PDB file of C-alpha atoms and ligand atoms in Angstrom:
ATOM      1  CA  UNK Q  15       0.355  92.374-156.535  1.00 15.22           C
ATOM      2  CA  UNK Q  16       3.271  94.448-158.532  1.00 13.35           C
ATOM      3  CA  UNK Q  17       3.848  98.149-157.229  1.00 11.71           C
ATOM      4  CA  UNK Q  18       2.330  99.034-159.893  1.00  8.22           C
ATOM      5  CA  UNK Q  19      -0.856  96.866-160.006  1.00 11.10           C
ATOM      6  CA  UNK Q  20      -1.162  97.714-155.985  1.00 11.01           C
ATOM      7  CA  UNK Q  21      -1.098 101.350-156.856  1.00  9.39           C
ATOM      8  CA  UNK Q  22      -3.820 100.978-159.225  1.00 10.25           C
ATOM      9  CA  UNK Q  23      -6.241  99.602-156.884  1.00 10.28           C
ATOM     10  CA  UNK Q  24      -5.128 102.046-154.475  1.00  9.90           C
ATOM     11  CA  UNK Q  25      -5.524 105.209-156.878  1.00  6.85           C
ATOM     12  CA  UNK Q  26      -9.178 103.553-157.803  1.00  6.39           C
ATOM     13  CA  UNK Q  27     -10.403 103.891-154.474  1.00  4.11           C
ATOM     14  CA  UNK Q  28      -8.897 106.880-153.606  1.00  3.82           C
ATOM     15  CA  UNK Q  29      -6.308 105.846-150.945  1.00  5.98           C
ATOM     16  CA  UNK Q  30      -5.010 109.635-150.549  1.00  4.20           C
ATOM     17  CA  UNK Q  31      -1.419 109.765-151.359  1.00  2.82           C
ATOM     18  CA  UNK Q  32       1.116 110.808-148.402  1.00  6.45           C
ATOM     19  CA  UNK Q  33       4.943 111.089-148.772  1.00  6.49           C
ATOM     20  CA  UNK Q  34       4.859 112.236-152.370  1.00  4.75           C
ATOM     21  CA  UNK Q  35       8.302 111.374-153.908  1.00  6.77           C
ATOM     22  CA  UNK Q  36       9.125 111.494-157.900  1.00  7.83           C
ATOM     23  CA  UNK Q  37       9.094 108.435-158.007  1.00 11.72           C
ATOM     24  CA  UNK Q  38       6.377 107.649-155.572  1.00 13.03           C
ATOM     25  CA  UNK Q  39       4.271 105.134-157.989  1.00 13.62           C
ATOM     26  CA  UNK Q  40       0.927 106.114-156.080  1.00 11.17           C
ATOM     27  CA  UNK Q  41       1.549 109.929-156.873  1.00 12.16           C
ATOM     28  CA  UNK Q  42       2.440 110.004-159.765  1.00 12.09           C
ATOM     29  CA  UNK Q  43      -0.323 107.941-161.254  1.00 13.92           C
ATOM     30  CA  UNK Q  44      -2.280 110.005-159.411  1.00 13.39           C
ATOM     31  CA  UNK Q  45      -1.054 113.265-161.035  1.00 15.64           C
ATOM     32  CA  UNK Q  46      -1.099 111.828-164.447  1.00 16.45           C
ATOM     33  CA  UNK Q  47      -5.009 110.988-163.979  1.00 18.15           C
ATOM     34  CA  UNK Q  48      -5.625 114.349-162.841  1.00 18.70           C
ATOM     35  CA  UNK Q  49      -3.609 116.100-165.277  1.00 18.48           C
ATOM     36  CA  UNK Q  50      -5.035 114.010-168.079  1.00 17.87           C
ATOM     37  CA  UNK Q  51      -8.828 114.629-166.681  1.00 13.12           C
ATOM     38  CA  UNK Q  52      -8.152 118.087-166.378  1.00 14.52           C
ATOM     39  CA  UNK Q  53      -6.876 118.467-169.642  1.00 12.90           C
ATOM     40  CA  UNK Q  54      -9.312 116.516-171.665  1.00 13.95           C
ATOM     41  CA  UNK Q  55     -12.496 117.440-169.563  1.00 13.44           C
ATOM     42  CA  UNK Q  56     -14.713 118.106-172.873  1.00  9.25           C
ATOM     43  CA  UNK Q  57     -13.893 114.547-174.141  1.00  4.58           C
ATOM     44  CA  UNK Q  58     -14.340 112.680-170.594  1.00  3.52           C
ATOM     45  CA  UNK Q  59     -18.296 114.874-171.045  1.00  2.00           C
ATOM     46  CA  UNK Q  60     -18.357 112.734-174.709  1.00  2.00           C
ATOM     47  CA  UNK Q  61     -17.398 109.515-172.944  1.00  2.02           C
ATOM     48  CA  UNK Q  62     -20.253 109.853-169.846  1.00  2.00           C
ATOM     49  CA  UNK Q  63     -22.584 110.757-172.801  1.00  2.15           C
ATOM     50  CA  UNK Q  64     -21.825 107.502-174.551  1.00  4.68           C
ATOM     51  CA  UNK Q  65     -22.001 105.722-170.976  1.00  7.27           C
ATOM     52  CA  UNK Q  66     -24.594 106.929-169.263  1.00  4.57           C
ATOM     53  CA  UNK Q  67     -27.222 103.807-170.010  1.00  6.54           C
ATOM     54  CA  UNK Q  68     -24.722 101.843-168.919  1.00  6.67           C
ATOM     55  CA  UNK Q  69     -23.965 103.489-165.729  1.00  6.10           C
ATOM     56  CA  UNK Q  70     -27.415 104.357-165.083  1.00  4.62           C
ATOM     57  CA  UNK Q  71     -28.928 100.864-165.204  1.00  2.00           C
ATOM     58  CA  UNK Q  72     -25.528  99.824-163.353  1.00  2.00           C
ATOM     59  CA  UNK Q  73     -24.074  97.482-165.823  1.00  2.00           C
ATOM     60  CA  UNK Q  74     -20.957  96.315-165.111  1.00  2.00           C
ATOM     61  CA  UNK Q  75     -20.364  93.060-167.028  1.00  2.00           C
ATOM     62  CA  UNK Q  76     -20.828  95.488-170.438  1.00  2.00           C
ATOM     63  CA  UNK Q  77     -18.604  98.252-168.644  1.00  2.00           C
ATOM     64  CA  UNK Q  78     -16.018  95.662-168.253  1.00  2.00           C
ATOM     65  CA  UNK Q  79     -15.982  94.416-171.673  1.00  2.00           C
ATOM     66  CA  UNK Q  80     -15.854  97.717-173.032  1.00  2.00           C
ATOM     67  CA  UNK Q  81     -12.925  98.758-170.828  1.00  2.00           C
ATOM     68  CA  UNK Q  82     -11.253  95.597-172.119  1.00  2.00           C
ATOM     69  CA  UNK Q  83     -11.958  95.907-175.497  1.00  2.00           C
ATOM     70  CA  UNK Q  84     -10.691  99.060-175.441  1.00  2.00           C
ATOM     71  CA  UNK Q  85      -7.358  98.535-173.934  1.00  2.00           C
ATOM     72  CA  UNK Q  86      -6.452  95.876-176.266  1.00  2.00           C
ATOM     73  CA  UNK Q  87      -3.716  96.728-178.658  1.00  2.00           C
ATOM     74  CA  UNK Q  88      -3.440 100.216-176.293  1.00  2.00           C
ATOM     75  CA  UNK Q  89      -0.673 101.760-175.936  1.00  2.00           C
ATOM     76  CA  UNK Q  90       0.399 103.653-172.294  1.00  2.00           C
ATOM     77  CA  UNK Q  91      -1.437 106.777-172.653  1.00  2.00           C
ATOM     78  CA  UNK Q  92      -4.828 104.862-173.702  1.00  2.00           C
ATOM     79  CA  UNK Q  93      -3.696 102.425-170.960  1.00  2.00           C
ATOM     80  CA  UNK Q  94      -3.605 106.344-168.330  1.00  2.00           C
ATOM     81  CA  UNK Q  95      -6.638 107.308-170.592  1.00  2.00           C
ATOM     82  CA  UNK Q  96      -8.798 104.258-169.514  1.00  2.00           C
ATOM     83  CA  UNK Q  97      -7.597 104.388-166.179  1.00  2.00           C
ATOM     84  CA  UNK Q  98      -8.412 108.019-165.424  1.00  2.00           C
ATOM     85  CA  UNK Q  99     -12.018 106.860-167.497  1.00  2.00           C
ATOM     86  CA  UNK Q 100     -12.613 103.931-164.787  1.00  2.00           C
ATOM     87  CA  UNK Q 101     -12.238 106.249-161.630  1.00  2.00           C
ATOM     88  CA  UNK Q 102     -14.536 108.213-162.869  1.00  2.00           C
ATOM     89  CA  UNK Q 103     -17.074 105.642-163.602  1.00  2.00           C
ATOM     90  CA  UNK Q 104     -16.196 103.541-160.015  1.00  2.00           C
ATOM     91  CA  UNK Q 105     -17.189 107.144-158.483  1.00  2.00           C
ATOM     92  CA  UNK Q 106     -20.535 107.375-160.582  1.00  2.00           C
ATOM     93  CA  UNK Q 107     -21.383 103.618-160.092  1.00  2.00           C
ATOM     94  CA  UNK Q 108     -21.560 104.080-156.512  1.00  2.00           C
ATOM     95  CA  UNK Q 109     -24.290 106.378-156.113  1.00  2.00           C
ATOM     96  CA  UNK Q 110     -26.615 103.566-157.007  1.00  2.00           C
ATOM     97  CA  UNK Q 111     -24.821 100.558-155.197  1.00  2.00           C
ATOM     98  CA  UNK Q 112     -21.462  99.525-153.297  1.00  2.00           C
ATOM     99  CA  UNK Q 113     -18.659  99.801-156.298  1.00  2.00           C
ATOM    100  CA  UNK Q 114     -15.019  98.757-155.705  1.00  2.00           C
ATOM    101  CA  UNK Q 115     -11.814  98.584-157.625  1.00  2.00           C
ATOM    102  CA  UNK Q 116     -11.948  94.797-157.293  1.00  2.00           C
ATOM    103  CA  UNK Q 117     -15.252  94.316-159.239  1.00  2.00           C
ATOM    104  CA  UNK Q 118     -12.468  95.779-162.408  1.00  2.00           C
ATOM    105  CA  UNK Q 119      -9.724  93.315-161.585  1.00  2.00           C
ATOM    106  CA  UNK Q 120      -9.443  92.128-165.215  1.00  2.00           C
ATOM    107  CA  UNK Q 121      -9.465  96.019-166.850  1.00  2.00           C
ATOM    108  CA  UNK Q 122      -6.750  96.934-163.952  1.00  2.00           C
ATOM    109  CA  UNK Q 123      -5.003  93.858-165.553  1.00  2.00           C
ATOM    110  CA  UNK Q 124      -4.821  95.285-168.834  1.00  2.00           C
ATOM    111  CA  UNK Q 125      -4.332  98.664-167.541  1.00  2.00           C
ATOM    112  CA  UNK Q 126      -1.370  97.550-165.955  1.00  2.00           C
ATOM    113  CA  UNK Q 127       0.053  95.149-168.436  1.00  2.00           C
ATOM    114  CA  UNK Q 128       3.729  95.410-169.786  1.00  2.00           C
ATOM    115  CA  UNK Q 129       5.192  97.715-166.724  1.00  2.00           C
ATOM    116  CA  UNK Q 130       8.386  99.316-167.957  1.00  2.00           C
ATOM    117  CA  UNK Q 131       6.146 100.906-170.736  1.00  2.00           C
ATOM    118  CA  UNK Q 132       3.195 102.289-168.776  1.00  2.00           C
ATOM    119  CA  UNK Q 133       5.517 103.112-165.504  1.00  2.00           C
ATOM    120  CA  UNK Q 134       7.746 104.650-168.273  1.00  2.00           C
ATOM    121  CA  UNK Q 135       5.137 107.326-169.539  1.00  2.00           C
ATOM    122  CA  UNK Q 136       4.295 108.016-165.858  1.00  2.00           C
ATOM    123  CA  UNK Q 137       7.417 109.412-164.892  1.00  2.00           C
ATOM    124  CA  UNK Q 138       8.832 110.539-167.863  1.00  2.00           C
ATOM    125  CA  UNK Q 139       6.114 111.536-170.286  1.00  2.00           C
ATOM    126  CA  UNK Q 140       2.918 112.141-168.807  1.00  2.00           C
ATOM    127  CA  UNK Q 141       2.696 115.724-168.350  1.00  2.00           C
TER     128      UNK Q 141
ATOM    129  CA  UNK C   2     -23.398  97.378-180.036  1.00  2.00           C
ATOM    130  CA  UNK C   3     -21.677 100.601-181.287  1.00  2.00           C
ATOM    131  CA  UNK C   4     -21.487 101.457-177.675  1.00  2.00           C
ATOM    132  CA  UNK C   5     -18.315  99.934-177.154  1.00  2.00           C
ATOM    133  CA  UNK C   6     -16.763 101.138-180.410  1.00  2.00           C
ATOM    134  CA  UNK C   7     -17.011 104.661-179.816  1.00  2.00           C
ATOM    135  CA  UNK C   8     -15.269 104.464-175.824  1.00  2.00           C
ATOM    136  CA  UNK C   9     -12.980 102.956-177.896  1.00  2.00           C
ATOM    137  CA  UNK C  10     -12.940 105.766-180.706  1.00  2.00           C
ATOM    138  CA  UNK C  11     -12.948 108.578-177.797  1.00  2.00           C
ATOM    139  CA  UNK C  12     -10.157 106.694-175.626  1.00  2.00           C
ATOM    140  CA  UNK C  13      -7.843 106.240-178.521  1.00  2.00           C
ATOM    141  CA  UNK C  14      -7.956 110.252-179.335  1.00  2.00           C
ATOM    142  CA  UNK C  15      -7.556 111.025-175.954  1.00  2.00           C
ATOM    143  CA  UNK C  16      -4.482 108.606-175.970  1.00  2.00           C
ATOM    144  CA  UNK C  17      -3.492 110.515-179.229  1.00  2.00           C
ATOM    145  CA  UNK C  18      -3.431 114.166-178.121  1.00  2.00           C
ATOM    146  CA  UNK C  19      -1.512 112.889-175.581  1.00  2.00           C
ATOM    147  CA  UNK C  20       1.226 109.786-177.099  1.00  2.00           C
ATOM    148  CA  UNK C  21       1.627 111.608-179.859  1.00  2.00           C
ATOM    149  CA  UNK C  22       0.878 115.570-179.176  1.00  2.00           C
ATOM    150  CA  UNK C  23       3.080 116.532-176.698  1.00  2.00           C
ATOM    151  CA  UNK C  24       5.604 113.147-177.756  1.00  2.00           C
ATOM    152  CA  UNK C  25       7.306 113.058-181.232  1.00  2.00           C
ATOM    153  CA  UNK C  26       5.588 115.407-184.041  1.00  2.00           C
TER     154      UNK C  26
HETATM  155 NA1   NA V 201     -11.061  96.644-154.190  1.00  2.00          NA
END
């Protein structure tokens, strides 16, 4: 619905960003995901480890919760941290059955809420 | 659970390296 919410779903099923700009929303999310996954690659190895049951056995209903739980007080880099988290685990999910961005509406909802905050650490602080 | 605590644990450091590393001090 916002640019911002709409380039969530898009970077969750991996739309494939042409026209970068810098301030392309799509992009730049996409960068920040990719920079942070690159960067923390060790602890995203932790967080599979602590997953793996639940991606295994294809639970999403505790994967949501968790997700949720998580971003609750979180601040935007948690907010980037869960995000980058959730692609991952869409991608996984889907080697046992059809997984979308859609079946995460409510995480993408708390990803994505207050804007200027989370858009602000995009651009200006992500990297 | 547990489970859900320590996503929570791992996503917050992440979050910290980051908003908070490379931010202020
Ligand atoms: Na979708």
């Amino acid at each position: 619905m916002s640019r911002l919410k709409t380039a969530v779903y898009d970077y969750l099923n991996d739309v494939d960003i042409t026209e970068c700009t810098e301030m392309d929303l799509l992009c730049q999310l996409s960068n920040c995901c990719d920079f942070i996954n690159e960067t923390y690659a060790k602890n995203y190895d932790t967080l599979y480890d602590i997953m793996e049951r639940d991606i295994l056995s294809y639970n999403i209903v505790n994967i949501k919760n968790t997700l949720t739980f998580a971003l609750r007080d979180a601040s935007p880099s948690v907010k980037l941290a869960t995000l980058t988290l959730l692609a991952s685990v869409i991608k996984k999910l889907n080697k046992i059955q059809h997984t979308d961005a859609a079946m995460f509406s409510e995480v993408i909802d708390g990803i994505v809420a207050e804007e200027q905050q989370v858009i602000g650490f995009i651009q200006k602080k992500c990297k | 659970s547990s489970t859900m605590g320590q996503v929570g644990r791992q996503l917050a450091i992440i979050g910290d390296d980051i908003n908070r590393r490379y931010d202020s001090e």
